[PDB]
Amino acid sequence: RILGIPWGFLIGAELTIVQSRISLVNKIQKVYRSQGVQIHNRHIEIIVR
Amino acid sequence: PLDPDAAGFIYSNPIETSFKQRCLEDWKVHHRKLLRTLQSEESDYMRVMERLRNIIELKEELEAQGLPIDGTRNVLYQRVQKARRINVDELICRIKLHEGDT
Amino acid sequence: AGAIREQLADLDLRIIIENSLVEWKQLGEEDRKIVRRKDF
RNA sequence: CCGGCGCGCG
DNA sequence: TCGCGTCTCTCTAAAATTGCAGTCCCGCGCGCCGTAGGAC
DNA sequence: GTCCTAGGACTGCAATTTTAGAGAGACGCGA
């Protein structure tokens, strides 16, 4: 409603995906770190991408 | 394609649309845009909102056909039973679109 | 199945596309099965 | 030289 | 002389359950049992 | 003896099953 031509869809999708990736990695890393499992961020970022 | 005109296109040529119909479509798409930006971006508010949308008991049966004669008595009955055989503008312009204006 | 094969053989796919598009536009210009018919 | 059922090992 | 809520359906838009479709670690060893049915 | 011989647990989802919503042609009653 604020932005019309693709800056509505482009920026909306960009903001949603950027926020989703941050929380998706945090939730997965939080589960494994609670169990003492050590996995690099690269491996999870490959899956989330 | 049976039509030789469709030769060249991928999924046949565009369908025939008269210049009169194309102008009407462009008039409609413009006003659906104007109505959209009204809700996103007081007695004057309702009168323009209604204006944009407007740019789109046996006697009740008469609207299904052309209403030939009818009116006095039993004519409506005979016709219904025989019909089965065939079977503010100065304020609207104050808004402005900005499509393509980066 | 013979009737089905005959129906499939004489189909005009371009007419199918045009009729589907025009019906989709008619539905849009007018909410569960009003959408499910569109998805069809 | 094919599949089911039962029993096991890591 | 029609007019009036309305009797009895009437057809479809919109949810609301509801019956499939799909899936459910890996790698080894051994044994047993199939292969059925009927008028001769 | 036998030799041929013909019933989980969860998720996802479109399919029935309504529920409703208005709605109308003929109409018994009625003005």
Q: CA-to-C1' distance for A11 and F4, Å? A: 78
Count Cβ atoms below 10 Å from residue B12 Cβ, excluding itself: 19
The separation between the first and the last C-alpha atoms of chain B, rounded to the nearest angstrom, is: 42
Tokens 């194309």 — which residue?
Answer: B22
Catalogue the long-range contacts made by C13-18 (C-beta closer than 8 Å, 24 or more residues apart). C14/B1, C14/B6, C14/B11, C14/B12, C17/B11, C18/B15
Cβ B13 vs Cβ B5: under 8 Å: yes
Collapsed DSSP state (helix, strand, coil) of residue B9: strand
Cβ C29 vs Cβ B16: under 8 Å: no
Cβ B80 vs Cβ B61: under 8 Å: yes
Experimental approach taken:
cryo-EM
- A18 reaches B (C-beta below 8 A): no
Cβ B47 vs Cβ B88: under 8 Å: yes
Cα dihedral sign, B9-B15-B18-B20: negative
Count Cβ atoms below 10 Å from residue B34 Cβ, excluding itself: 16
Q: Is C36 (CB) below 7 Å from strand E?
A: no
Q: Which chains lie within 8 Å of chain B at 3 or more CB pairs, if any?
A: A, C
Give dist(CA B48, CA B9) in Å, integer: 43
Cβ C31 vs Cβ C21: under 8 Å: no
Q: CA-to-C1' distance for A46 and F1, Å? A: 70
Cβ C11 vs Cβ B5: under 8 Å: no
User: Which strand F bases fall within 7 angstroms of a protein CB?
Assistant: 23-27
